[PDB]
Amino acid sequence: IVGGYTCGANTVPYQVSLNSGYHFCGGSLINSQWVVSAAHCYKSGIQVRLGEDNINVVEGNEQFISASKSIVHPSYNSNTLNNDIMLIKLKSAASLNSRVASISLPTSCASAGTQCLISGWGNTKSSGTSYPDVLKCLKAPILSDSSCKSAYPGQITSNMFCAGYLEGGKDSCQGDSGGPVVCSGKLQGIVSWGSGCAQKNKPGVYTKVCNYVSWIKQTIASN
Ligand SMILES: [Ca+2]
Ligand SMILES: [Ca+2]
Numbered sequence: 001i002v003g004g005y006t007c008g009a010n011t012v013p014y015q016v017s018l019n020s021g022y023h024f025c026g027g028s029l030i031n032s033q034w035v036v037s038a039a040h041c042y043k044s045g046i047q048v049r050l051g052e053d054n055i056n057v058v059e060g061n062e063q064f065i066s067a068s069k070s071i072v073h074p075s076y077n078s079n080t081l082n083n084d085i086m087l088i089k090l091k092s093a094a095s096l097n098s099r100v101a102s103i104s105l106p107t108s109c110a111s112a113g114t115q116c117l118i119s120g121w122g123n124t125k126s127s128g129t130s131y132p133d134v135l136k137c138l139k140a141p142i143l144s145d146s147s148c149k150s151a152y153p154g155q156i157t158s159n160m161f162c163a164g165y166l167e168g169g170k171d172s173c174q175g176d177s178g179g180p181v182v183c184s185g186k187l188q189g190i191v192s193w194g195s196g197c198a199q200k201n202k203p204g205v206y207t208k209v210c211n212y213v214s215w216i217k218q219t220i221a222s223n
Contacts, residue, residue, distance in 0.1 A: 001137065002172075029094060
């Protein structure tokens with residue numbers, strides 16, 4: 001998260017650190033046993049780290065649950081990042097509390113202008129590389145589809161939306177991938193991609209979770 005702020009410990013209870021020996025991607029806890037993340041965050045041997053604030057020191061609220069199974073979206077295209085969403089099932093149900101909570105799936109798609117909370121342990125620097133150990137948050141509006149398309153011409157599918165700022169300076173970044181975009185307490189987006197981080201006219205592109213609630217629900221229903 002570039003230009004964001006320190007969330008505060010466990011203020012984003014659905015925030016997940018996907019750990020494979022290291023935090024490599026974010027995720028969103030959607031129920032006791034399921035994390036959604038970006039499909040381009042897919043790896044084998046994922047441990048799902050819940051209740052994380054500082055991903056580098058054990059602070060007592062962590063729940064480390066390895067991934068029982070990962071389900072990259074069937075139509076995930078790694079080249080265009082279309083359908084950049086993946087389901088991760090925990091080996092065991094998370095112990096849900098005030099700090100390890102699931103995030104609700106969107107009934108409706110959030111509109112442009114809706115302010116969203118993006119969070120992750122990604123690079124905090126637009127230029128260079130500084131990885132925070134504690135969760136960074138960014139309040140960022142969903143941008144219009146036209147502004148998203150004009151920012152990334154020929155690249156924005158109906159399954160993506162842009163959030164952030166066209167003047168840049170505030171954006172999800174590398175390492176925020178798979179992380180939540182929560183608007184009105186609902187997981188509206190997944191940190192998917194962007195041309196760099198916090199560049200002018202290059203907002204973050206996020207998986208439009210509203211389009212996958214069916215697929216997510218049916219997948220949860222049989223896995
Ligand atoms: Ca920790
Ligand atoms: Ca990345």
